């Protein structure tokens, strides 16, 4: 019972756009210490994407005000905006640790050597969430999360290159997000571009091994690689 009860709940919360409920449910499914299917795995990923997405979107807006207020020399107001920006940060960080803990305690730990596709998926996700911490961290805390993200992405990419077709959505997605890590977090555009251009070219090369069943996903992500490339290179 209990598992299907939570999976059912997760699906209703997705339809209801109640992503905090969706996340508590997939957290509880994961904590059962049994493996996830592709479908379950995507529910986990959707739930946390949307939770943390709302925090980052909020963080960004308040951060932006804080910088304008510092610039304006407004001391009394700045202390209030900063407090609120930091409250939103605490919520954001908690969402990311919670995920990363699940990746460490359950999801990555339980992958076989031969579960290349799961390993790639969860490592990309570890990379993503350390990257979300890196968007808001400073000082020596920043350097740690920056490193952990790169280590995760690098490991996932090694495996994807060896074990996945260049047109596989999880690979392209990983490429897209790693290239973002380099461009935004590492402030290293040259590196970000080759990586994105390599993955694009590589997908282009093998288009006649794409089954119709994923023409939607892989062209969608390829389009986003090219947008990032034209945006950055200018």
């Amino acid at each position: 019972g209990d598992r299907e009860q939570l999976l059912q709940r997760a699906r209703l919360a997705e339809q209801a756009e109640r992503y905090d409920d969706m996340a508590s449910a997939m957290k509880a499914v994961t904590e059962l210490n049994e493996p996830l299917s592709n479908e379950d795995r995507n529910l986990l990923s959707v739930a946390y994407k949307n939770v943390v997405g709302a925090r980052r979107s909020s963080w960004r807006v308040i951060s932006s005000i804080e910088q304008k207020t510092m610039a304006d020399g407004n001391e009394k107001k700045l202390e209030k905006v900063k407090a609120y920006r930091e409250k939103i940060e605490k919520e954001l960080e908690t969402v990311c640790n919670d995920v990363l803990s699940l990746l460490d305690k359950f999801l990555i730990k339980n992958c076989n050597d031969f579960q290349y596709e799961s390993k790639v998926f969860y490592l990309k996700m570890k990379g993503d969430y350390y990257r979300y911490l890196a968007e808001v961290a400073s000082g020596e805390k920043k350097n740690s999360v920056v490193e952990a993200s790169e280590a995760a992405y690098k490991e996932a990419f090694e495996i994807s290159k060896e074990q996945m077709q260049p047109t596989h959505p999880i690979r392209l997605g990983l490429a897209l997000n790693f290239s973002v890590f380099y461009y935004e977090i590492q402030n290293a555009p040259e590196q970000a571009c080759l990586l994105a251009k390599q993955a694009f070219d590589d997908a282009i090369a093998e288009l006649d091994t794409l089954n119709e069943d994923s023409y939607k996903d892989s062209t969608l992500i390829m389009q986003l690689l090219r947008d990032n490339l034209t945006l950055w290179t200018s």
């Binding site: 392209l172 897209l176 997000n177 969608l220 992500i221 990032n228």
Partner: peptide, 5 residues
């Protein structure tokens, strides 16, 4: 500046 959906 999109990331993976």
């Amino acid at each position: 500046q999109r990331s993976a959906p």
